[PDB]
Design a protein around this nucleic acid. Sequence first.
RNA 1: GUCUGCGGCGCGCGGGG
DNA 2: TAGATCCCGCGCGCCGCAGAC
Lengths: 919, 407, 408
Amino acid sequence: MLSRGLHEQIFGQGGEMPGEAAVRRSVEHLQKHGLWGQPAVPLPDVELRLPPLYGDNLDQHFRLLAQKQSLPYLEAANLLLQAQLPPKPPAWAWAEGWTRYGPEGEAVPVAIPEERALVFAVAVCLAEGTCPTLAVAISPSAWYSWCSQRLVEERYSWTSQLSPADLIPLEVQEQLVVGHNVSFDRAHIREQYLIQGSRMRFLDTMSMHMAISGLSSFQRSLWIAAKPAISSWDWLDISSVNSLAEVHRLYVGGPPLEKEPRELFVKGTMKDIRENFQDLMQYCAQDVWATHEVFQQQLPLFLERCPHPVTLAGMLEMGVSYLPVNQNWERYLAEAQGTYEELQREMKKSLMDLANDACQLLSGERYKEDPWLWDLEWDLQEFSEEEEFQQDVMARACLQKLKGTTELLPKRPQHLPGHPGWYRKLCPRLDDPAWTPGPSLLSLQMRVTPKLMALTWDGFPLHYSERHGWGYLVPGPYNDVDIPGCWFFKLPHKDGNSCNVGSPFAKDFLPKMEDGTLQAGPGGASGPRALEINKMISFWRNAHKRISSQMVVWLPRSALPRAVIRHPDYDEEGLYGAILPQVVTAGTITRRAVEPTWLTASNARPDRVGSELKAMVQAPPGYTLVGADVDSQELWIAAVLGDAHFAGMHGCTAFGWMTLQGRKSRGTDLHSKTATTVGISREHAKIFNYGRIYGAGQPFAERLLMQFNHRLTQQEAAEKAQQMYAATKGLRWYRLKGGTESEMFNKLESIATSDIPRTPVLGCCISRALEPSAVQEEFMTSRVNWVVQSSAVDYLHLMLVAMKWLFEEFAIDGRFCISIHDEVRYLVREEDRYRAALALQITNLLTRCMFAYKLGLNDLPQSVAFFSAVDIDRCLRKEVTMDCKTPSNPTGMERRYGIPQGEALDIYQIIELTKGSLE
Amino acid sequence: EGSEALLEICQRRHFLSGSKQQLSRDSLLSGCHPGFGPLGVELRKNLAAEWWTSVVVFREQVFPVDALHHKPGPLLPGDSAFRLVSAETLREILQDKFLENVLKTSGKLRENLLHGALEHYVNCLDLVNKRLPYGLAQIGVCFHPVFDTKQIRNGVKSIGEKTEASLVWFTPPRTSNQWLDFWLRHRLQWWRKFAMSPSNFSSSDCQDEEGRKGNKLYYNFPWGKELIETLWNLGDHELLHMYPGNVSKLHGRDGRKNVVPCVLSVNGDLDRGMLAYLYDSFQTRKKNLHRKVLKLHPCLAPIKVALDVGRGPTLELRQVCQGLFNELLENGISVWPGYLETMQSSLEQLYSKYDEMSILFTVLVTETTLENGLIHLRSRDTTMKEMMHISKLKDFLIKYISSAKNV
Amino acid sequence: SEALLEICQRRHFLSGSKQQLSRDSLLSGCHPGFGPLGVELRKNLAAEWWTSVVVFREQVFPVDALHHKPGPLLPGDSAFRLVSAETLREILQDKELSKEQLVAFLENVLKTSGKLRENLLHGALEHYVNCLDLVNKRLPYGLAQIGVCFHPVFDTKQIRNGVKSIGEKTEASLVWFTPPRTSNQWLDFWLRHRLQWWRKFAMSPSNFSSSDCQDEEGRKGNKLYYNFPWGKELIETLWNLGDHELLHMYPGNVSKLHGRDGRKNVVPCVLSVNGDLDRGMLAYLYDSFQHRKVLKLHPCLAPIKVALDVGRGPTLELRQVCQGLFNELLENGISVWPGYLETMQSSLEQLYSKYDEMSILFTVLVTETTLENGLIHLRSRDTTMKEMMHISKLKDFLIKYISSAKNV
RNA sequence: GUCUGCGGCGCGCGGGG
DNA sequence: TAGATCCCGCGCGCCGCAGAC
């Protein structure tokens, strides 16, 4: 205990050989930079009887756990690897259900494939929803095919759980399934949507490929271009672009796979699918065969590149995810769509009103002096007592018909003469489009919308003359930065923003609507309303397609278990379904899961219509989500690696000292506490630090500072090298980059060029594309980023395997890990939820200790030994206490409040009966 | 300041409201104003017509109903708040011997109109063959008691008149929540329809003291939000109370079962909605455009087209407008009978007068109209002129109104 | 003659229980209101009156008059429908009484609180002040308004001593300010126009009659009675009140209530025309009544023009076309009865009998032939004769028919 | 013979995830 | 950092088909 803050352990011998020299070095390092003297605040000590361990050390324990988890599926993988299949059958059957093709092509109807290993691929037609249409698989025995009951002509109206295929025997044992983008194929498998867990596990060849010679983003931007500028291209042969054809070409020697020109499944209708049944079956079987060949060529390579069994166990576990919806998904979609449609209509009305009001400037040639509409054409071209009186031109008038010599242009040929040219162009035709009265056909994307609104600063034309929004936009030929406008145009210069559109920038205007010199101003009636309308619309505008069209399968009543039944929340015409995220277990050069609509840093953010997407993921009755977010994951990993490189003490390097001791509130934390004080902006320094620990330079820092706020080059990171001077004082010689400042980056650089597995914890190899040994290259920033991201991935794998071990050892009805931006969630029955929390805390105690076990350390600080808070909620949200903006309130839905727990959960045990609560 | 004060100029002036130099928002919201001008009456009638078209029409199982302006005397529980005074001051009992002093068993003016709808529900039940989903709508004037709460010079409580449209909808209890939500959304759409700034209209949820949940709609006036439309779940209890002798007669039929319908009342104030539309239509500082104009929606503006003549060498030939004006009267297009004042009025002055009067289009007939008939047409929304032709006027205006009716 | 109360009550035409309306009180304002068809007939008649009088004259404007009267220092002799005139707790006429200090003259008695109006002439005179500016000094012009007026009733079968009752009558009132010269000309013109207007929608215009009467206050008066079988009633009154009524208000000042007629300043003379719309509907309904139970009412005044029904045929695939035609015929503004959704397969003969009792102009029958080629059956109310017709050709015909109804 | 208001191909730019 | 490329959108010319002066 104590000794600058450590934890109490019941595993591991005495150890304790830090070295007096190490102590002196740590003390003399902490004397400078930070302050050595900090009494701090000791934390309470926790005593608990952990479950029995395996092996001699913790590494052996995790190895044994992962081997026990993976061997039943490694057997099936090896069976598939050593199997040989006959040529494809000549003609594929037509009967509904599953048909097995014995040798010579003998079709026999079979209920299901009784096989322990398949290579799977599914075809879906975009015409009739997202229901699967055809499927074919291969086992060591023979081929199988499935027609989907496609041939019958009967309406079904979608929303059916029996529609997809079937691959699990009733059993009244492992059945690995390999595929390319296997999540897509499993989305149409059925029995994966069941709330009760499934023993089948999936393997993905793209995840195998991203790990084995995967391609980065910048590198992929040049690998197609060759299907400081100078560099070495020796990595082309080993890298591909993850497409099935390219992957088959790279890993398997053979002719290129033919690509179907018709593409009836993606662009076609059901009739073409029926007509081209044999060709589509042949194409699908060819894809299956290519996937099988790639898997055979990759499995030994994968096992060689990722020797630690924990990596494979974690990859297997992360492939099974579960997002229950509970019939609030479609209601949310309807509400969001309605909000979007009415907000868009109001925006259109506002723009029409602005256009109408703008016409008055020509009544006295007042547009000539308007800075906004000075350059518009503003052109107008022409080109018996009472009965007797009643019969007086009663209907129109006699001979009132015009000879039409002057009136020879009918309808659009004479479109609103007299009106300004721009207003004329905006308006529709008189007859064909129903005339939609007003300056219709107006939208934000039109150039006309600028200069009808917004335009803060001095001059904001936004004219499309290879400069977009022109402006010097700073103090100090004429009207270069002046307000009134009407420049001489002797020579337009792109001053101020010298980079022009060349620099990437970002969506740096939507953040910037809050002041940011971006506002309507003189209008005061409808100008600003449109800006806020765009603010609330922008998210759902370019994301409704992804959020919508998500495959949801609703279980029947008989499918639900007794847990859902016999609950206060039950029936009420209730629909219970789930959404498989369709996430690749690895999608980047670093083995982090990639998903554009679920694995994103978004939450219920006010003044947004499509927000609260993460919400509405509601567990069924009798179930809840136990989740936890790793407290400063990447920063902690970098700090512990740096200190371990420096000495055995955790706080020796002065960076882990700040991480462990610094606090967000009343503390000198790097996030929102210290970096902002030295810097300008507040809460933007988090991104600054996360980008600097991943590798960057003075130009990138200067560009990021410009992005945060508008300053001249000197005030940017050109004369402001202090942050680089401090923090990472790299390029230091006469010492034999290492140290000389508060950050150690030397260990990351050494790992980059080491050519070993390069992952200090679990020894997962880097992609062959980026290996310095395989190819000489100077893409250092990618490798230093990869090491930390892969360390985070291995952390996640360790948590997943530990959680599965704990859930299988004790009767905890919980499964279906979900990973989102380093946060983990588990769906568990309510009566064991506390246990699921406690076990989860133990995971953080064990996983971190594994990170401590390697790199030559044997102690873990008490601060990081446990999760800050563990949330036992009924829905997914950033914080346990959150609300929604666009709806009336969270209470509109059945959104109760969770329990952070943390310290209370320590008072129980992990056995089934805790505090006599059972029975 | 120009907020609620500049509007009152060109409001009483152009006879959109009674002219008594009141200029009191409290008086208007209270309903004690002497009355509305002819243009105010026309605008209120247009708003009522739009409400009727969007509620009774394009909606099945909706029928009209009329409620009396006065209620019967006998069987009248309760008493007026100000009338109830018996604490002291009873020295003079010299009077010899209904009569009495506790409400005298006398009549009472109606404060609410949905009571008549509830009473007539039993007679209107047979209209829909006892089908549970159906409603009754009615627009009527109600008198309410209002006191300034300041001084004693006012004395007895003042009385204010206000026109409201109330729809009582009977729906199955099971679907009551979703039907109420749909009705609230429809009313929000309608109020945002014909709205120059729909954001000013807002909705909120409220909990009744009994436990019933309802929705309240407000318009954000320059001084503060004012209630305009209220949706309440009546709870069906008072309908049972009105008929405690036997409830076996009132049970409606839903699907193949018999149940007592749930009642939702949606009551909107046409007097306060019209003022909201007036305020919203009107826009100030560093505007550089001036030209104050009430930009009411074309679908409910009081006056559509204004006729005039100009520089007519032979004024006797102006009868070309006559008849054409009459033609415009056919098919229900309102016209301002101009070409009568014939004073030396500048064109800009007349255009400003028509703009403040909320006239969609201004039609001018010139000497060049007798042959190759072209009439100068000016638009309210954009001060721009057209030529067009006589034969294309009528249908075009109808088209415009129709094209305004549905976005 | 007899049994008209029962048939009127049936078919939802009149709102009330059996024998509640009775023969008496029906003319009187205080009787159970009309049914939804009656309200629609009230709404159509008011629209027709507005078209005939207000817009077609280009000199008559709407006016607004509150139902209540503040009555500041009001005289102690008047109608006194509700002397208290406060919200709730109206003391009715309260003849005599108020002798004690409680409920006395100094506050809330003598009509200081106010009264309930009985005619819209007073509101017209009040609004004259700004209406004169509205017309820009033009003297000959009028104000029209349809609104409810409250009257006192008495001798109701003398069942019990009368305690008075509030009779509400929806009256259309036109107050015409005209120059003193040629006032009789305007009076005669308005009388003739009103007679023609009331004779226009009547199947038997000979029933309507006119008479003249003289009063000391009024220079000349005219009355329309309609000559009801039980006796001569009063359906419309026309009176020449004179300028003294206007002079009664605004006693102070001068040269303010006068206008400019023929470039001559003159004090206007007021002519008041009052028509009981409720009496007008009852007379028209009697005229429609005649030997089957069918009422021959004018097409323009028909509360419902066309109706939809389905006879046999498949249950499905007919509601879609019916709803589409419903939308199309509602878009153009002709109301249609949603009779195609009625279940239980009501008898065709009973359906036709009820529809004729409805007074609906036409009955539309849709069968599988409509699905095959869009052909339906159209049945007329008066001739009771069925004809084959195309689905797309109804709309124009109906409006064409109404044009024939509108055109004389 | 004009000068256009109605169709099909290319081309520039951008933004996104 | 970790950027992402077809795609969707908004403009343009070039090539024609009609049509009144």
